[PDB]
Write a protein that binds this ligand. Structure first.
Ligand SMILES: [Fe+3]
Ligand SMILES: [Fe+3]
Lengths: 153, 153
């Protein structure tokens, strides 16, 4: 099957970004239903928060714009910064209001498992959940659910 | 073991870039000797070429600056463009002379296997080769070989 080339990944066209939390949205770029893995541009136009969760596997990121981090580490990432998260580490992603929106290229190995404050597992978000959310949004905004399927490898 | 945070990944400080071919160099960001996998910033300040090779596994890229591509595909990538290469596909990477240097964030699963024109396998470049090259360079330019070891996960 073919390579993928997606020009202007962190596009200014808002239709391509699928709401994930109230303050954070994602543009899918590449999705592997068999590997439970995907690549996306994560976007927060203002202050943003993704609730605590862990990944059984690794996460890689390259910061395109803005200012973000995880509360469980001591740094904050701005344009040009690289991040790797170790498997199994629980983390809470935050985005700060900056001149530019937070835009981050992420390569994610799922599932995410949502954690309450006690550190107990309360829900999950896996590649099928991601596909379903992206197809539903893309159909609604007029891009078509079939566009999401074109991303699959 | 810890997360990795590398600020200013595609740095202007030339010491961090390790010569790979005559025209192309790489800054290691993250290296997994056990997974035969690494992440880097690939840099070409002028015209550049990486000889034909294939990867038994996948490659992901996010274009930071410049203009580059693989001769075996019909596109060329510029700032902001995402690329995925399918496992087992033989490809020849080129960089064009542009206002900015070619800078690309790559997540590579090794080995690379070098190909002659007949499509026969003539050499290889694996994670141990990469570590050895990076340690040798970093020692020479004064960053220290031990810095490379700090990248390992
Ligand atoms: Fe996460
Ligand atoms: Fe390659």
């Amino acid at each position: 099957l073919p390579e993928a080339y997606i020009p202007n990944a962190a596009t200014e066209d808002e239709r391509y970004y699928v709401p994930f939390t109230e303050t954070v949205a994602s543009r899918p770029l590449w999705i592997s239903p068999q590997q439970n893995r995907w690549c996306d541009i994560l976007l927060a136009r203002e202050a943003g928060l993704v609730n605590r969760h862990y990944h059984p596997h690794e996460v890689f990121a390259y910061t395109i714009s803005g200012k973000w981090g995880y509360l469980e580490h001591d740094w904050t990432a701005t344009r040009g910064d690289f991040v790797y998260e170790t498997p199994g580490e629980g983390h809470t992603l935050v985005a700060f209001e900056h001149e530019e929106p937070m835009r981050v290229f992420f390569i994610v190995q799922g599932p995410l498992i949502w954690l309450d404050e006690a550190g107990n597992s309360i829900g999950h978000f896996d590649v099928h959940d991601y596909i379903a959310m992206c197809r539903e949004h893309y159909e609604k905004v007029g891009l078509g659910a079939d566009l999401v399927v074109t991303l699959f490898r």
